[PDB]
Scaffold this active site. Structure first.
Site, mmCIF file in Angstrom:
data_model
loop_
_atom_site.group_PDB
_atom_site.id
_atom_site.type_symbol
_atom_site.label_atom_id
_atom_site.label_comp_id
_atom_site.label_asym_id
_atom_site.label_seq_id
_atom_site.Cartn_x
_atom_site.Cartn_y
_atom_site.Cartn_z
ATOM 1 N N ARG C 103 0.819 -1.208 0.000
ATOM 2 C CA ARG C 103 0.000 0.000 0.000
ATOM 3 C C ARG C 103 0.856 1.262 0.000
ATOM 4 N NH1 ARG C 103 -4.174 0.919 4.884
ATOM 5 N NH2 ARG C 103 -2.384 1.551 6.203
ATOM 6 N N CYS C 105 -0.147 5.590 0.655
ATOM 7 C CA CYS C 105 -1.195 6.464 1.183
ATOM 8 C C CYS C 105 -0.768 7.926 1.153
ATOM 9 C CB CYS C 105 -1.481 6.095 2.648
ATOM 10 S SG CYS C 105 -2.362 4.548 2.902
#
Ligand SMILES: [Cl-]
Lengths: 125, 125, 125
Positions: C103, C105
């Site tokens: 991920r 972000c």
């Protein structure tokens, strides 16, 4: 095994970067901003000029890589101003013609060199 | 087949994320922030300090995955402030040495945990 | 050789993008926003509804591709406001269940159509 893509037409990767990297049959292109290799400066002060130049730069890189715009699986388009999306969009569309890659789009707080737009992509050989 | 990369040197994945996923010969690393697994906090409060720690973190994750900095094909470098661009790049380049990944760079409005810099990457095995 | 993914349940790919592209065993999905295909508009005006709708939309694309959340290797999650991080995160974790993609972000300055959240990913077939 990795191979550097160095087009003499796209902005020269002067740092710890490369215009793109080919690996496992894919071409991973750096985030082009709207500079002209021939000037080392922006093609111009408008979203319109920088967007064309950016798309031109991506083409140069891709084409040097043995890929093409038609083979771009995915782009990320970054804007200095969210208000420039449609104009950038019209130009992006034109640059891609019938090809419609996956895409992520947002406005950044700012971009390198006060650039109005930056586009990166992943394409295939 | 996804394989999870869990380096005990890189900040822990205490979340719905993995540090990196290996798949089809490629390592997809999360955005590292400048946390020092050893201090459990940001390496420092300075762009310089966070940046080092970020690049080192990626190193740990890559090597843990069976990859390396030399096998990084593409990175995306995200800053809380664009004025930190050159300083970032210097610390970046030191980390990669003679390897020149593809790259995209921009300044986010903000990063998780007030972080000044975040860097993600894809690499090969 | 690129396959265009078009779920009739994810928001229509209207303009020069495709919801996702399949290439060389991977699915590269566009950045989804919290539009509900059924209503032709944002699921809601809050981070919670849009985040839910964003995660739904992705499932659709991925599933349409022949993939699944299970098979996501990497996401990028983009917030209009860094402080929706906690709230978004719990939604994201819920959608992914026990699967933990790599991920990245960050908070964008702005997202297409004033969206509060955008999520892209790459996944395996
Ligand atoms: Cl599911």
């Amino acid at each position: 095994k990795l191979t550097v893509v160095a087009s003499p037409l796209a902005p020269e990767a002067v740092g710890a970067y490369s215009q793109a990297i080919i690996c496992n049959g894919m071409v991973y292109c750096s985030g082009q901003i709207g500079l002209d290799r021939k000037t080392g400066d922006f093609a111009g002060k408008t979203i319109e000029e920088q967007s064309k130049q950016v798309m031109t730069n991506l083409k140069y890189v891709l084409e040097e890589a043995g890929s093409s715009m038609d083979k771009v699986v995915k782009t990320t388009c970054l804007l200095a101003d969210i208000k420039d999306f449609g104009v950038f969009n019209g130009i992006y569309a034109e640059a891609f013609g019938n090809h419609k890659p996956a895409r992520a789009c947002f406005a950044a707080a700012a971009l390198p060199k006060g650039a109005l737009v930056e586009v990166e992509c992943i394409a295939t050989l």
